[PDB]
């Protein structure tokens, strides 16, 4: 996260760290959506141009974390993957369309003050909240500039009109994506960055005061560049696939 702030303790209890077993390193962000399901970006797990194709056995999920590097005895929980599920129309060849994946844990994780699932939006919450100018929150242990933080970082960013999103890049953007960030003129700034991948873009519904995951950190050109915006997987648009996976293999 660049131009973010240190998270408060328990401010993002759905935040998940995807962790490589060997060599032990952060791989990506992710999010807890139930006691046994973790949501992330597909590119975190599969990305052939960079020879990335992780199997279950290569990874661990660490939940309830605050510190990037420390092992948080009595706080974090570390879980094993039972199975990975990648969107069958995930477009790694062209633009990361449908950049979304699910991970089922071997065993249910115990909720705590530091570990708690986020909600996934229904259509009406999505329609109410995914509006240009409405701010969301992005969290991550990713790089601080286009170099890593000691603790979980947080940044609030306004959703950006689709025409401005499109006009900022040469990439083909789809209905399964949205972009967020300040414009050059708005003065303030901030962005997700490498390592923030697969982490959640959340919004607090003013209707029932619950936190919803509206996006997934997907891609950008650089990090926090003027005239550029971060791109996010549109969770509600891929909701049907999510339900299906969890219904079938639940």
């Amino acid at each position: 996260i660049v131009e973010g702030s240190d998270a408060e303790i328990g401010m993002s209890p759905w935040q998940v760290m995807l962790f490589r077993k060997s060599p032990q390193e952060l791989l990506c962000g992710a999010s807890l959506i139930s006691d046994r399901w973790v949501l992330t970006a597909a590119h975190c797990l599969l990305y052939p141009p960079w020879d990335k194709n992780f199997t279950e056995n290569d990874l661990l999920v660490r939940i309830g974390k605050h510190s990037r590097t420390r092992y948080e005895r009595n706080i974090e929980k570390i879980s094993m993957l039972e199975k990975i599920y990648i969107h069958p129309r995930y477009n790694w060849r062209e633009n990361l369309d449908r950049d979304i994946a699910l991970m089922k844990l071997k065993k249910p994780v115990a909720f705590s003050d530091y570990i708690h699932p986020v909600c996934l939006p229904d259509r009406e919450t999505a329609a109410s909240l995914l509006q240009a100018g409405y701010k969301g929150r992005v969290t991550g242990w990713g790089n601080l500039k286009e170099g890593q933080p000691s603790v979980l970082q947080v940044v609030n960013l306004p959703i950006v009109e689709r025409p401005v999103c499109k006009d900022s890049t040469r990439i083909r953007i789809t209905d399964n994506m949205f972009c967020a960030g300040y414009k050059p003129d708005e003065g303030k700034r901030g962005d997700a960055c490498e390592g923030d991948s697969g982490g959640p873009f959340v919004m607090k519904s003013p209707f029932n005061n619950r936190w919803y995951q509206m996006g997934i950190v997907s891609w950008g050109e650089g990090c926090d560049r003027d005239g550029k915006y971060g791109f996010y997987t549109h969770v509600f648009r891929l909701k049907k696939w999510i339900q299906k996976v969890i219904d079938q293999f639940g």
Partner: peptide, 10 residues
């Protein structure tokens, strides 16, 4: 590498 070692159990 920069990371504290997690319990071998994991």
């Amino acid at each position: 590498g920069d990371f504290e070692e997690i319990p071998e159990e994991y």
